[PDB]
Structures are given as C-alpha cells and as structure tokens.
Design a protein around this ligand. Structure first.
Ligand code: 9Z9
Ligand code: 9Z9
Ligand code: 9Z9
Ligand code: NA
Lengths: 110, 127, 258
C-alpha cells in the first residue's frame, strides 16, 4: 500500500490530491503507518476495520458494483437535506414531549 | 432522602449544601422517616408507629426562627382554620381529638408544602 | 379610525417592530429550551415565572395592537392564527393558575402540564425568525414537493384510517373477554389496531389470544396486515415517488430553458 501511494505521488503531488479516492487510501495507509511509531493507535479496534475500508476502492473496479456507490455518493447531499428535515422535526416534538412527560415516566422523558 | 429520590424521581440539594442537613424541594411532597435508637444497647430500628407532626417555628434564615404562639400553631397546622394560613396539608384520614391535627404514620403519603398567603413562608423573594 | 389605525399600521409593519418581536421570541425559545434539563429548570424556577409573565404582557401588547391595526385581516392569515391560539392558551392558563393554589397537587395535576405544553408551541414562532435570517431553503425543494404530494396523501391517509376504524369496530364486537387487557374498551381496540399498523410485536397479540381465548383472530389479523401495510403504505411510497419524478422533469425542462 505504501508503495502504491509512493507511485501516485510520483506523478505529481497535486493531481494525486486532486481526487477523493486517493486521499481516502492515503488516510488509511497513514493511520496504519503511524502505528509503528506511536503506541496508542496500534490497537486492533483502529487497525483492523481500516484494512476493510481499504477494500471499497478495490471493489470500485467492478463497475456493476461501482455504479451503486456512485449513486449513493451523488444522492448523499439530498439525503443530508432530508436528514436535516427529520432532525428539525424531531427536536420540536422532543421539547413538547419532555415538557409533558417530565416528572412522569422519567425513564424516557427527562 | 432515598425515599424522596425514589418517589419524586429527582433530588437537588441546596446550592450551598451543608453536610449536617440535606435540603428538600418545596415542589416534592416531604415524607419524613424516624427511627428509635436505644443508647444502652446497640439495637436501633425504624419507628413503626403513629405520631402528630406540627410546624412550631419558622425562619427566613437559620438563627431567625421564632416559636409561634398556640393560636398561630393552630392557624398554621390545623385544617379547621378558615383564614388562608395553612403551611402544609396531608391527605390522611386519621386525626386527633377535635379534628385539630392529623395523625401521621410511616404509611402516609407525605406532607405537601403549600404556603397560603397568611403563612409566614408566603411573600418570600430570593435575597 | 383612519389616522389612528393607519399610524398603528405604519408602526406595526415597521422594520423595527418585527425585529423587536423576533428578539422576544428567540429569547422565549432559548428559555424554553433551557427548561428541558431539570438541573436548570429546578434552580431557575423563580426567574422563569417572572420572565414568562413578562412575555405574556408582551404578547398582550402585540396581539391587541395587531388586531386593532388589521381588523379581520389579522384573523385572515394563519401564521397569526397560530399566535392567537397560543395567546388564548397563555391567558387561560394564567387565569387558571390564579384561580388555584400553586402547590404539589397542582404540579402533578395532568391539566396543568397539558396547559404548559401549549406554551411550548411558542417555539413554533421561532421558525418565522429562521425564515427571515434564512433556513438556506436547503429544504425548500423537499418541502415544495411534499406540498405538491399532500392532496392525495390526505385522501389515502383517511381511507386507511377508515379501514382501521371498521376493523376496530368489528374486533371490539367479537373479541371481548379474550384478552380484555388489550381491547376491553373501544379506544384501546382502536389503538391496538393502529399499533399493529406499524408491525411491532403484532404476533404477540395473536399468541396472547391463542393462549386463553381462541385463534380466530389469525385470519382477521393476516387480512388486516395485507390490506394496510402491504397495499396502503406502498401507495404512499408510490405517490411520493411519482410526485418527485414530476419535480425532476420540471427541473430538467427548466434548466434546459436557459
Ligand atoms: C405562499 O407562497 C410562499 C412561497 C415561499 C414558501 O416558503 C416555504 C419554505 C418551506 C417552509 C419554511 C414553508 C412552509 C412550511 C414549512 C414546514 C412546516 C413544518 O414545520 C416544522 C417546524 C415546526 C414543527 C412544529 C413542525 O415542523 C418543519 C419541520 C416543517 C417546515 C418548517 C419546513 C419548511 C417549510 C414556507 C413564496 O411564494 C411566492
Ligand atoms: C413563505 O411564505 C408562505 C406564505 C404562506 C404561509 O402559510 C402558512 C399558514 C399557516 C401554517 C399552515 C403554515 C406554516 C406552519 C403551520 C403550523 C405548523 C404547526 O404544525 C402543526 C400540525 C402538525 C403538528 C405535528 C404540529 O402542529 C400545526 C398545529 C401548526 C401549523 C400547521 C398551523 C398552520 C401553519 C403556512 C405565503 O407567502 C407568499
Ligand atoms: C413558494 O410559494 C409556494 C406556495 C404554495 C405553498 O404550499 C405549501 C402548502 C403547505 C406545505 C405542504 C408546504 C410546505 C411545507 C409543508 C410542511 C412541512 C412539514 O413536513 C411534514 C411532513 C414531513 C415530515 C418529515 C415533517 O412534517 C408536514 C407535517 C409539514 C408540512 C408538509 C405541512 C404542509 C406544508 C407548501 C405557492 O406560492 C405561489
Ligand atoms: Na418491527
């Protein structure tokens, strides 16, 4: 993985960084790399699943798959707007529910 | 404090808490628990018996408490007084002779602080 | 009636009257979101009642002045109509408080709290503030398409409620004293059917009935689930997808217009 990041950088620092998949792979390999030096990161809860998040850019080459990921990524901002709607709706009802069922059923409404 | 915490699902102590005395919220119904202690022998147990509880003095601050007179104690602690002077009220059927004061017990609901307008606890604004 | 009302107007729609009121409403909502911790509401109870009487007086000011200014045109707009209803609740709980003894038995009275939540409704005015500052209209499009979808949403929603209501009536008629804990009352029949419509523990009521009563409830419940979850909610999904498809075609033709 480090060799591959080196090859990418060998083509020009900026174009390697003019992407998103490259910065993702770089972040993964860098977090993996600092485990050799630092001690509180070289633990399994931080090193194992990153080697599986490394696999998605591999799966991208399987374009019957890649179109699903591209759809998800493209639709993400609209989902952000819908998420904002739902949260902004939930906060108001949370206020009303607390100020009703406070001091009564405080297991759920304090 | 353990029982008030359980019934009233919340306990807040005085902002300037004192280790000697815990403080009780005027919103929560105050149900006190007493225990009888033998000093000769180690045996100490809860007081499973009836009693008459009365408020006989009050102070805006500590070191300002003043015993009230008998008429004042009557007007404050007894439901028979017409003047809006009651300091507390409890929902217990037992009562003393002449119905003057309630007869409480460990199984009673508790003491509900209400502070009618004539009562000394009324018209109190944080200093 | 022409000069007095008119100056009341030109002071009412003034670009400072609105900012003053929005400052009031944002302060009231920051208090109202302060009051939902129990570590601050219990401490600062004595200042909150003072502040809320202050806000009641301010709302008297605004509501009376707006009514005198704009006649029944004030009653015409629904944004204000919300404010008027909130006002009515505020004044009613004020007078009820004064006509009772503010003690523990009234703190734990349900009607006191019920009148208190409608005070929470004041926070709705805050959206008006958020509108002028801007919400960024990031959800202007989703809201617009939901706005387009609602006319049929209401219709299918009331149709499925009607199905709920008929099944609830018949289930009350039939399955009394076969688990009365669930639907011994018509209202709890109706709630049991409504909570079945979300499919949470719906097998539990079948098993519970089969234990002591009898199992005839299984064809009724299967047909119920078929109709409601399988053919009605999917209608809501379908109509929403079609509405957003129309929105998309409108956007495509509009962007090609330029
Ligand atoms: C007449 O024409 C008007 C048009 C401009 C229309 O702007 C709209 C923008 C979306 C917006 C702000 C509008 C109305 C309902 C608003 C929704 C009501 C719900 O309320 C909330 C908040 C309060 C909660 C109690 C309930 O949920 C939000 C989640 C929901 C809401 C605030 C999302 C945003 C919506 C106005 C211009 O025409 C020229
Ligand atoms: C951008 O400009 C828009 C303007 C037209 C504005 O019309 C408004 C009419 C009042 C109306 C319908 C509007 C927004 C919030 C609506 C309130 C949100 C609350 O939601 C409810 C129902 C849902 C509950 C969950 C919460 O409470 C109602 C009690 C409350 C409500 C539905 C009362 C009616 C309000 C839109 C035209 O401008 C040119
Ligand atoms: C720009 O001018 C537009 C104007 C026409 C405006 O029509 C409005 C009709 C009310 C309507 C449909 C609109 C926007 C917000 C909509 C609200 C957002 C909330 O969303 C919901 C449903 C989704 C939940 C997540 C949150 O709550 C509803 C309860 C609430 C809502 C759907 C009630 C209905 C509101 C559009 C014409 O002008 C010429
Ligand atoms: Na489920």
């Amino acid at each position: 993985l480090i060799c591959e990041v080196l090859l990418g950088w060998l083509n020009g620092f900026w174009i390697f960084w003019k992407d998103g998949w490259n910065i993702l792979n770089f972040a993964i390999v860098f977090i993996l790399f600092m485990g050799f030096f630092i001690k509180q990161l070289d633990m399994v809860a931080i090193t194992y699943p990153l080697r599986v998040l490394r696999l998605v850019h591999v799966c991208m080459a399987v374009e019957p798959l890649a179109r699903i990921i591209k759809v998800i990524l493209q639709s993400m901002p609209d989902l952000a707007n819908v998420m904002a709607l739902i949260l902004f709706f939930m906060l108001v009802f949370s206020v009303f529910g607390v100020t009703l069922f406070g001091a009564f059923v405080p297991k759920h409404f304090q | 404090i353990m029982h008030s915490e359980e019934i009233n699902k919340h306990y807040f102590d005085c902002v300037i808490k004192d280790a000697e005395m815990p403080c009780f919220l005027f919103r929560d119904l105050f149900q006190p628990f007493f225990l009888v202690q033998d000093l000769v022998t180690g045996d100490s147990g809860s007081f499973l018996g009836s009693y008459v509880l009365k408020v006989v003095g009050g102070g805006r601050t500590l070191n300002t408490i003043r015993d009230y007179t008998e008429e004042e104690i009557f007007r404050y602690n007894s439901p028979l007084d017409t003047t809006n002077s009651l300091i507390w009220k409890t929902k217990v059927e037992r009562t003393t002779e002449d119905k003057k004061f309630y007869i409480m017990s460990h199984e009673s609901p508790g003491v509900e602080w209400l502070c009618l307008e004539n009562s000394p606890c009324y018209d109190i604004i944080p200093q | 009636l022409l000069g007095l009302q008119q100056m009341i107007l030109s002071l009412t729609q003034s670009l400072g009257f609105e900012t003053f009121i929005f400052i009031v409403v944002c302060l009231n909502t920051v208090i109202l979101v302060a009051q939902t911790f129990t570590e601050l509401e219990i401490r600062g109870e004595w200042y909150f009642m003072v502040l809320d009487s202050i806000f009641l007086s301010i709302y008297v000011l605004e509501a009376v002045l707006k009514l005198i200014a704009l006649g029944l045109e004030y009653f015409y707009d629904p944004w204000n109509n919300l404010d008027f209803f909130i006002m009515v609740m505020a004044v009613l709980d004020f007078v009820l408080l004064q006509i009772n003894s503010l003690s523990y038995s009234f703190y734990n009275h349900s009607l006191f709290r019920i009148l208190k939540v409608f005070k929470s409704m004041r926070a709705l005015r805050a959206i008006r503030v958020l509108r002028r500052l801007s919400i960024l209209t990031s959800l202007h499009e989703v809201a617009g398409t939901l706005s387009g979808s609602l006319p049929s949403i209401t219709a299918i929603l009331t149709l499925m409620f009607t199905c709920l209501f008929l099944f609830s009536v018949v289930l009350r008629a039939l399955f009394q004293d076969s688990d009365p804990k669930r639907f011994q009352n018509i209202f709890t029949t109706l709630f049991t059917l409504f909570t079945m419509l979300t499919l949470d523990d719906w097998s539990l009521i079948y098993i519970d009935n089969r234990a002591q009563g009898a199992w005839y409830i299984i064809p009724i419940l299967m047909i119920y689930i078929v109709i409601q979850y399988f053919i009605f909610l999917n209608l809501v999904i379908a109509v929403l997808v079609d509405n957003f498809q129309m929105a998309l075609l409108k956007g495509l033709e509009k962007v090609k217009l330029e």
